Design a protein around this nucleic acid. Structure first.
Ligand SMILES: [Mg+2]
Ligand SMILES: [Mg+2]
Ligand SMILES: [Mg+2]
Ligand SMILES: [Mg+2]
Ligand SMILES: [Mg+2]
Ligand SMILES: [Mg+2]
Ligand SMILES: [Mg+2]
Ligand SMILES: [Mg+2]
Ligand SMILES: [Mg+2]
Ligand SMILES: [Mg+2]
Ligand SMILES: [Mg+2]
Ligand SMILES: [Mg+2]
Lengths: 107, 203, 173, 191, 48, 100, 196, 141
RNA sequence: GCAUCGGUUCUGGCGGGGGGAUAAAGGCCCAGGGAAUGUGGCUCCUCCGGGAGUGUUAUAGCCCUGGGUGUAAUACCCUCG
RNA sequence: GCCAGAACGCGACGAUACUACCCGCACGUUGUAGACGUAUAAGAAUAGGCUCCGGCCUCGUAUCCUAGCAGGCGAUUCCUCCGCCGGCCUCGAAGUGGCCGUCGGUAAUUCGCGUAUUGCAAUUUAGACACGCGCGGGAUCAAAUCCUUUGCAGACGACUUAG
């Protein structure tokens, strides 16, 4: 009886902030999308929405789960890593945490 | 690229520094890694070169109190690899400590990671990285010569696990033969329409 | 760099005492025509009493390889400056064009004698028409009869983003 | 310079078989069987004729090509040891003290053992154990001679070298004190 | 500057943690190497 | 918020007039305030919640449009099951590579 | 090495039971009461299971043995318990030997013999806090030394800027664990021998 | 003299050897330049298999088991094409296992969403019979 | 959130035009001349793959030169959208 | 060999009153360096291997699984897979898997009713690790320290003993 999954997003990992060797800039983040390994592949995901989903302590308005929303802005480097801009910068304790790259602005 | 729950790396045939670099990058990216058979890792160059490097390492020690602060020289092959990885990890931060906690290293193949799929890293494999004819040594041999005390125990346990794996492999071959026979027999009972459709689709 | 042979023809500025001055032609291997003209003026300063300020460039043309799809043996006579003197040496290359031979020459000189572009003078580049005038063993073994060889211990091509592999690769293809 | 091809050939006489698998050479003939692991050298073996083994190195440098003739000679030595064997003859030399030599085969192991006494007149008895497969005997043909015979030239010569090195004079003019056991003849058991 | 007259150091660093023993009863840190050909036998005892 | 696949369903039997009158601007939101008010009156005053009643006009238009559409869909062997089954991403599914 | 399991005898004496207690006088002395039932339940099935496990897996076999301190003139009643390795034979032989020795006395002439060279392990005589002169055997400073002559004059140079671990310092002396070796047994005398 | 040698047997870089390039096209070798480069051309009528005459670096090429026999060294495009058609290189390549694998990869990449759903359904239908046969074989032991 | 715009900007394709040896090449069609890492033949040897010699297209081909299709394509640089 | 023993390294064993231990559910006020199909054991060589012995090996670009109200109800038809508990038999590198049964659910085929209104998107609150609890039972009825004492010890703590 429906042994299938329900995933409609591509998974990614929050690698770091945009930075030099010593100076970091939290306003944009670096995202590694699964299976995206070049700029040509990364171009498909430009403009796609991204959610960082985490859990908090208090239940505020029917849930303990909070979301930070952003979108993919441009590719980064040559290996498919992308730059993402969120409404607020990501917590920076989430370096290595998972994010969901939606398909909401499709085609 | 693919995100796994945990990646088990069979350390045999890998170059220590390159595997350490790859593993450190994965750990900082958030991947969990278990490296087995750290005594079968390889270092390029002569074993005399490796031994001289470790002797130079051993010479370092805090002068005023060798029980604190000084470089603590770990003899086991998994600990040699762990030192190599910690060199590439920013271990003095909380983020680096978490990255290192995402890692496990062992000599031989302990039972949990026995009966599990062990990956390889082609960017660090000796056969793919070293010119044939160049000298190389074994981290297990270096550890044994610098004071690691369990080379023979690991060898005996690996022999036992390889005998068990040989029995498994025999039953696996039997299962493969039976599955091939089953597919051949069922090829005459499925719809030819289904068969042609799958063949056209590429299956 | 990626070079191209240029025919550069230059001239001393015509004067009342010397109308219609002699035209001097050189073959210059340069990445572009600016460098070609610069090298022409450098060599013309070396050889004759003409400068860029007292002369002009009559013509600059590209000399394309006439048979770039034919394998040839090339002999290059060159003069170069080491750290402790100047030397002349003759080397051989196996290429399909004079430009490719010169590029291989530059790379080989840089690799074997640490000779930079600034310290090499290409005296002559000649296509060796025959086979018995090939003098170097490393070209002779390439022009050996019925030549064939395998490619042992060849590393397969694996994407650098495929970090982990489920089976051990083979080096037999 | 890297040479495109370096080739060498070994003829195999009719009475012996040779098997090469994973660069592990096995040679079997009338006098026995020998094995040699050559996996440390990148060489390509093949059968070029009915009874000729070809061994080649492709795109090798001088250092790599230098090992081709070494491998040929080693495999040829294995073949001649398997067919005809190897025999080394040593001579005892001394000025005043007769060197006493006693050779016996161990009971618990197949190895031979040689004890040397009265070397330069000192009381220590020096004992050297031969490599397996090497037989030692006192020469019945002439006095003060040792005969070492075997299938492997490497083992025979190494046992002889052990015997030779175990008898040395120290803190003396070696130009004057010549006592020792020295290898005198190298040859084959047959012919 | 160098020590004027040479002399060996006082005491041994091989017993260096000159602390109270952790336990009153002596500890056998190593037992004689086993040999299966020999008859079964105890390797130690206690007394006062 | 949709992904357009390459499968096209035939539409010869569908009522274009019905489609346009459904496409009229006020079709979906004209009654919405009243339905929300009725739902609130049911929930707050009542003790147990019940399904919002579907408008008769909307049900009639649904049936009228869907009849010929289903008839057309049945002519493709597995299209009905394909439309009945949901879509999800499996392991190794790469949306930048999948043709859809 | 690691201990896979240990098997105990059915009955333990109060001498050895005292070793498991700090306040034996006011305790309920229940040390091995539940364990003793295993010899009666299922005809010692668990005991046999553990012995078979030791036979199957373990490569080192030791016996747990205790002293009969009540036979000494000592005022102590709490016995001393330790592991003694069985050497020789197979693991099955070791297990059989140890099991046959259960709650049984072994005499020291069955372990050692005359003219044997043995080792003695013990904690040395304890001195309290002791200065460097006796603790390390350093030279006494001259008589006219101010602020004490029973010291080390220089406890370190300048540049390392720390007192080093190799410098003699006052502290605990004696009461150290020592394994003295190569002691000859001159006689093993018997208690019942009136002329030992 | 019995000789058992079990060393590897590579395919040789030689005149007439057909190489498969990274883009999927085929080129016969007409002349060896050096240890690492050759001169090659694919005069195939099928545009998916044809390559222009030029230098091929051996690192970007794979050696197919097809060798055009008695191909002259340095032969021009016309002679190479004549030998290519005479030997029937396209048919032999199509029969090779590499071409079949490439065709299967192309077919699997060309699937749509409906195609993938139908593939799942048909694979389940075939798997039913496969499982029945496997259970029967297991029961027979 | 979407649609339609404006400013800045990053990035991917598509259609054209010009120049150079009016690219050089190359594919076919001729006209001439050559050689070898010499094809077919011929001689000898090897019968065990094959090797050696002779000689210029034959039962493969290649190189050089002058032409035609031809203001061919291409790719390079520039440029209009 | 010998000395120390990580005071945030590990093992075996003994007794464990109680709020401590064991069994089932009943929630979760509480936490997580971060589930979303968290699916895949040969060993070995890489100048060689695998095999069902016919043949295969650049390529995990693979294999498995994957449809149904977040997955309903009832048929047709299926004997194929998933689990739940119980015999057992083997699993010591840091305790593992199995074939033998019960009990459930189960599109390989075809259908018949239900889905709407969450209003054009808004994490898909869905998992396993826990941890602290209350139900209502079983099991069990303990130690340690202070204190007095000893001197194999000791500046005081500590330690060896005895009560
Ligand atoms: Mg030291
Ligand atoms: Mg510390
Ligand atoms: Mg003298
Ligand atoms: Mg003294
Ligand atoms: Mg004074
Ligand atoms: Mg705009
Ligand atoms: Mg001829
Ligand atoms: Mg025209
Ligand atoms: Mg044109
Ligand atoms: Mg501790
Ligand atoms: Mg059932
Ligand atoms: Mg005292």
């Amino acid at each position: 009886p429906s042994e299938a999954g329900h995933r409609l997003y591509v998974k990614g990992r929050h690698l770091s902030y945009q930075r030099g060797r010593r100076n970091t800039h939290p306003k944009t983040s670096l995202i590694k999308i699964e299976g995206v390994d070049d700029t040509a592949a990364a171009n498909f995901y430009l403009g796609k929405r991204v959610a960082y989903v985490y859990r908090a302590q208090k239940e505020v308005r029917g849930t303990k789960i909070r979301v930070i929303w952003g979108k993919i802005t441009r590719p980064h480097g040559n290996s498919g890593v992308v730059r993402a801009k969120f409404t607020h910068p990501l917590p920076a304790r989430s370096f290595g945490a998972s994010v969901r790259i939606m398909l909401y602005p499709s085609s | 690229s693919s995100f796994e729950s945990v990646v088990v790396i069979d350390g045999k045939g890998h170059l220590l520094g390159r595997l350490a670099s790859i593993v450190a990058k994965q750990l900082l990216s958030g991947q969990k890694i278990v490296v087995v058979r750290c005594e079968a890792l390889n270092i390029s160059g002569e074993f005399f070169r490796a031994k001289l490097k470790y002797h130079a390492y051993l010479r370092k020690m805090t002068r005023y109190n060798p029980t604190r602060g000084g470089p603590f020289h770990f003899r086991a092959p998994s600990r040699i690899f762990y030192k190599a990885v910690r060199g590439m990890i920013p271990h003095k931060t909380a983020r680096g400590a978490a990255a290192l906690e995402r890692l496990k290293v062992f000599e031989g193949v302990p039972p949990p990671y026995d009966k599990k799929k062990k990956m390889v890293v082609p960017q660090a494999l000796r056969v793919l990285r070293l010119q044939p004819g160049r000298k190389y040594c074994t981290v297990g041999r270096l550890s044994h010569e610098v004071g690691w005390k369990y080379q023979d125990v690991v060898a005996r346990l690996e022999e036992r696990r390889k005998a068990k794996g040989a029995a498994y492999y025999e039953r696996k071959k039997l299962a493969a033969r039976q599955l091939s026979e089953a597919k051949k027999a069922a090829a005459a009972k499925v719809d030819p329409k289904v068969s042609e459709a799958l063949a056209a689709y590429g299956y | 760099g990626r070079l191209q042979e240029y025919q550069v023809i230059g001239r001393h500025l015509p004067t009342e005492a010397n109308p219609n001055p002699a035209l001097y032609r050189m073959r210059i291997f340069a990445p572009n025509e600016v460098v070609a003209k610069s090298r022409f003026w450098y060599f013309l300063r070396g050889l004759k009493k003409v400068k860029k300020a007292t002369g002009e460039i009559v013509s600059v043309n590209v000399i394309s390889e006439k048979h770039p799809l034919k394998v040839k043996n090339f002999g290059i006579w060159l003069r170069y400056d080491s750290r402790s003197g100047t030397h002349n040496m003759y080397k051989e290359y196996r290429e399909t064009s004079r430009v490719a031979a010169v590029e291989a020459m530059y790379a080989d000189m840089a690799a074997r004698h640490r000779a930079r572009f600034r310290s090499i003078h290409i005296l002559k580049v000649v296509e060796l028409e025959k086979t018995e005038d090939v003098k170097r063993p490393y070209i002779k073994q390439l022009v050996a009869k019925n030549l064939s060889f395998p490619l042992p211990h060849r590393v397969p091509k694996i994407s650098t983003k495929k970090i982990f592999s489920a089976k051990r690769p083979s080096t037999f293809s | 310079m890297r040479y495109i091809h370096s080739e060498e050939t070994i003829p195999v006489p009719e009475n012996l078989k040779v098997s090469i698998k994973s660069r592990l050479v096995t040679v079997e003939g009338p006098r026995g069987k020998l094995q040699k692991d050559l996996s440390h050298i990148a060489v390509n073996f093949s059968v070029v004729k009915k009874g000729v083994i070809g061994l080649e190195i492709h795109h090798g440098s001088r250092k790599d090509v230098a090992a081709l003739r070494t491998v040929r000679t080693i495999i040829n030595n294995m073949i001649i040891g398997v067919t005809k064997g190897f025999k080394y003859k040593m001579r005892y030399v001394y000025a005043h003290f007769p060197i006493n030599v006693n050779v016996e085969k161990n009971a618990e192991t197949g190895c031979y053992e040689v004890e040397i006494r009265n070397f330069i007149g000192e009381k220590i008895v020096r004992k050297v154990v031969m490599a397996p497969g090497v037989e030692v005997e006192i020469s019945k043909a002439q006095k003060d001679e040792l005969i070492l015979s075997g299938n492997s030239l490497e083992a025979v010569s190494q046992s002889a070298a052990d015997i030779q090195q175990i008898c040395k004079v120290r803190n003396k003019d070696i130009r004057k004190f010549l006592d020792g056991i020295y290898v005198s003849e190298k040859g084959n058991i047959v012919e | 500057s160098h020590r004027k007259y040479e002399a060996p150091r006082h005491g041994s660093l091989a017993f260096l943690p000159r602390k109270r023993a952790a336990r009153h009863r002596g500890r056998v840190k190593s037992f004689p190497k086993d040999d299966p050909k020999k008859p079964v036998h105890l390797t130690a005892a206690m007394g006062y | 918020y949709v992904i357009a696949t390459s499968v096209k369903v035939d539409l010869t039997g569908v009522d274009q007039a019905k489609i346009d009158e459904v496409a009229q601007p006020k079709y979906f939101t004209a009654e919405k305030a009243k339905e929300k008010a009725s739902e609130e009156a049911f929930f707050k005053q009542g003790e147990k919640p019940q399904k919002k009643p579907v408008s008769s006009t909307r049900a009639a238009d649904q049936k009228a449009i869907d009849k010929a559409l289903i008839a057309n869909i049945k002519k493709v062997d597995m299209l009905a099951s394909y439309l009945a089954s949901s879509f999800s991403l499996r392991k190794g599914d790469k949306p930048h590579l999948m043709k859809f | 090495l690691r201990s896979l399991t240990t098997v105990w005898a059915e009955h333990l004496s109060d001498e050895v039971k005292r070793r498991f207690y700090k306040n034996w006088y006011k305790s309920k002395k229940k040390a091995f009461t539940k364990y003793a039932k295993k010899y009666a339940e299922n005809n010692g099935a668990s005991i046999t299971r553990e012995l078979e496990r030791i036979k199957k897996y373990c490569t080192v076999v030791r016996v747990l043995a205790h002293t009969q301190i009540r036979k000494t003139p000592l005022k102590q009643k709490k016995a001393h318990l330790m592991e003694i390795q069985i050497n020789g034979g197979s693991v099955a032989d070791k297990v059989e030997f140890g099991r046959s020795l259960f709650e049984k006395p072994v005499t020291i002439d069955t372990i050692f013999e005359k003219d044997e060279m043995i080792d003695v392990i013990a904690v040395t005589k304890g001195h309290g806090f002791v200065g460097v002169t006796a603790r390390w055997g350093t030279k006494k400073l001259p008589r006219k030394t101010h602020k004490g002559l029973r010291k080390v004059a220089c406890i370190g140079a300048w540049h390392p800027s720390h007192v080093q671990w190799t410098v003699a310092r006052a502290g605990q002396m004696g009461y150290h664990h020592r394994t003295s070796v190569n002691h000859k047994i001159y006689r093993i005398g018997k208690g019942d021998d009136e002329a030992n | 003299a019995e000789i058992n040698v079990e060393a590897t047997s590579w395919r040789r870089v030689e005149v007439g050897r057909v190489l498969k390039l990274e883009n999927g096209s085929l080129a016969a070798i007409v002349e060896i330049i050096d240890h690492k480069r050759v001169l090659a051309d694919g005069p195939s009528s099928d545009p998916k298999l044809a390559t222009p005459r030029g230098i091929v670096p051996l690192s970007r090429a794979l050696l197919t088991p097809i060798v055009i026999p008695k191909l002259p060294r340095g032969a021009r495009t016309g002679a190479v094409k004549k030998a290519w058609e005479a030997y029937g290189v396209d048919a032999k390549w199509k029969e090779t296992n590499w071409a079949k694998k490439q065709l299967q990869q192309e077919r699997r990449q060309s699937l749509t969403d409906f195609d993938r759903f139908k593939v799942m359904r048909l694979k389940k239908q075939r798997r039913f019979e496969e499982r029945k046969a496997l259970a029967k074989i297991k029961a027979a032991a």
